[PDB]
């Protein structure tokens, strides 16, 4: 389908309120964690499901990026629109945020303690992403 582009990207975040630089990695066991560099399981496939809404699937884990309660990120093999579809919003400064409408939270690599510490701040750490091309 050539109606919308299929993008292949690595997602990379250093902030806000971040410590190190992180590549979003979807491991085969479903865990979503920080990768210090570009790896096979940090390679993401990005396709539109609505106009500005996006689904994100790790190509080597073939797990969709899905959000749980309080904003926890997990990789599930079965897509569900309410948990794994996000509005992609590109900020004026060039960073991409992926808001979940159901959970009212952005995709982030914050820990569970960080997500609770910031749950009423209007932003989560490690939620501003730069989309990087893969180096063959």
């Amino acid at each position, epitope marked *: 389908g*050539w109606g919308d*582009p*299929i993008r*292949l990207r690595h997602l990379y975040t250093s902030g806000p309120h971040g410590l190190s630089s992180c590549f979003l990695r979807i491991r085969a066991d479903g865990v979503v964690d920080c990768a210090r560099g570009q790896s096979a399981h940090s390679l993401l496939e990005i396709k539109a499901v609505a106009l500005r809404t996006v689904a994100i699937k790790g190509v080597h884990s073939v797990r969709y990026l899905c959000m749980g309660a309080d904003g926890k990120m997990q990789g599930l093999l079965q897509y569900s629109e309410e948990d794994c579809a996000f509005e992609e919003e*590109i900020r004026p400064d*060039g960073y991409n945020v992926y808001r979940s409408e159901k959970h009212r939270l952005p995709v982030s690599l914050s820990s569970a303690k960080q997500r609770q510490l910031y749950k009423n701040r209007g932003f989560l750490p490690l939620s501003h992403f730069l989309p*990087m*091309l893969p180096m*063959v």
Partner: antibody
Amino acid sequence: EVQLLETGGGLVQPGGSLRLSCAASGFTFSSYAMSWVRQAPGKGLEWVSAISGSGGSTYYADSVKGRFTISRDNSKNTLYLQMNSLRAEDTAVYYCAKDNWQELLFDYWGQGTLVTVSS
Amino acid sequence: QAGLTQPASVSGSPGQSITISCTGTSSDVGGYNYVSWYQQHPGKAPKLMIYDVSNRPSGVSDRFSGSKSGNTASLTISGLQTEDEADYYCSSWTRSSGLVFGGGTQLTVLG
């Protein structure tokens, strides 16, 4: 590293036919879309046609629909553009371009093969 | 049914900064975030310099930056160096017309 070798360029008369081939090497050819982008001498770039990666989806520009045919064969890692009903406006260097995925964003380019349509 | 509009020529001296505009419509530059910029030196293949409006592939110098406002995308090259002299083509995604290009801009580094 990654290499795209276009072949089949030369002189053809208006109304003739010619098929271009692109020798892909250095990547899993079957996983990425491909495209042909052409450039008339001393003029700008024009995207010609696109292929899905598996062959199932093809995309064409208005200036070549019905006359050009994009095709692939993943066994031999080769991309095809069969140009029929050639006109003078098809005179261009024809570039073989690898898609980053299926987004019409071009990772790598061949050095192009020139197609001259003159009588 | 028309390509994107770029200025035919842009020129600056070494060390200066320049901007190349790329005007489209609400169906291309102003309708998506998939504006790309390519650099083409004489007799060579185009080279991807900017993708998705503002992002740089690895190796591309950080003197190149892309941005967009309404229907106009812009490529900016700070600290002009001699080798920056080339042709620059912007490109945008479209829903039903494939990849549409701009007419190209010849960048001259006045030496």
